[PDB]
């Protein structure tokens, strides 16, 4: 959501459409180190669930690759 | 000397001792008799 | 002897007209821009040499 908000809001700080890109990509310059979720695992969030879904008729039938 | 920390579940059990003690004192503040 | 506070006969619990001066050094949130300033991006100040030189 946030990056889409960054895209559709006007360009006052940085260059759009131009090939310069004032802020240059520097992945190696950034933080190299492990966070506590790199050890203990990704933080637990509630599993995404479907409430009150209608019962699965045709549960025995297989879906055809839908290219048709 | 005591060197390594107390594990977490030990002091959890100690907390349980605390509110066991408290559970006792609530009983102790109840009246001597009851009018029925 | 046991010691206990008097009741409240009149007026507020926390002294209003009797306030002690608060002991921090009083730097305004907008005078020193650091944090706690929630300013809508429409209202952003002090751009006089950057974007507020070409206003509206």
């Amino acid at each position: 959501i946030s990056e889409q908000v960054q895209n559709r809001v006007r360009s006052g700080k940085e260059l759009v459409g131009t090939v310069y890109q004032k802020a240059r990509r520097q992945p190696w310059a950034k933080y190299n180190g492990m966070f506590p979720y790199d050890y203990n695992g990704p933080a637990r969030r509630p599993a995404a669930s479907f409430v009150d879904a209608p019962t699965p008729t045709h549960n025995a039938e297989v879906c055809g690759t839908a290219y048709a | 000397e005591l060197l390594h920390p107390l594990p977490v579940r030990a002091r959890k059990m100690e907390w349980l001792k605390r509110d066991a003690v408290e559970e006792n004192e609530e009983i102790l503040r109840r009246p001597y008799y009851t009018i029925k | 002897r046991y010691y206990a506070l008097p009741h409240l006969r009149t007026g507020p619990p926390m002294p209003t007209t009797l306030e002690q001066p608060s002991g921090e050094f009083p730097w305004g949130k907008f005078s020193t821009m650091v944090g706690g300033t929630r300013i809508h991006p429409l209202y952003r100040p002090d751009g006089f040499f950057k974007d507020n030189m070409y206003p509206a």
């Binding site: - | - | 002690q20 001066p21 002991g23 921090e24």
Partner: protein, 125 residues
């Protein structure tokens, strides 16, 4: 006279929140023992950073000296130095603290800079 090792023990936390008459002040945050020579070093180092035209440094030395060698046994919240104005010059916090910053290192225990009037010890501590 001929006081034992346990005497005038600084270790308690005091109830007196000091009142500093000077515009700014330097106040003991911990317990400890301070030598006179350390406070003299602090005083000189602070007098280097003062505008002697507008200001005067007041040092509170009137506390008892305890045998070790004679030094001071300081409780939390005991004021040490005071910046007193001779004129309308009003320092900020950054400036006053920048001034006391010179003399802080010579003092062996932690100190806080406090503004005129009574120590607000809710904010300091």
């Amino acid at each position: 006279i001929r006081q034992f090792r346990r005497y005038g023990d600084p270790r308690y936390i005091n109830n007196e929140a000091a009142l500093i008459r000077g515009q700014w002040g330097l106040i003991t945050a911990d317990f400890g023992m301070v030598t006179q020579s350390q406070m003299e070093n602090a005083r000189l180092a602070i007098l280097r950073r003062l505008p002697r035209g507008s200001f005067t440094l007041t040092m509170h030395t009137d506390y008892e000296e305890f045998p070790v060698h004679f030094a001071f046994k300081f409780t939390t919240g005991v004021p040490l130095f005071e910046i007193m104005p001779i004129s309308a010059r009003r320092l900020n916090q950054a400036e006053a603290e920048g001034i006391f910053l010179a003399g802080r290192p010579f003092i062996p225990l932690q100190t806080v800079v406090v503004p005129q009037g009574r120590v607000d010890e809710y904010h300091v501590f």
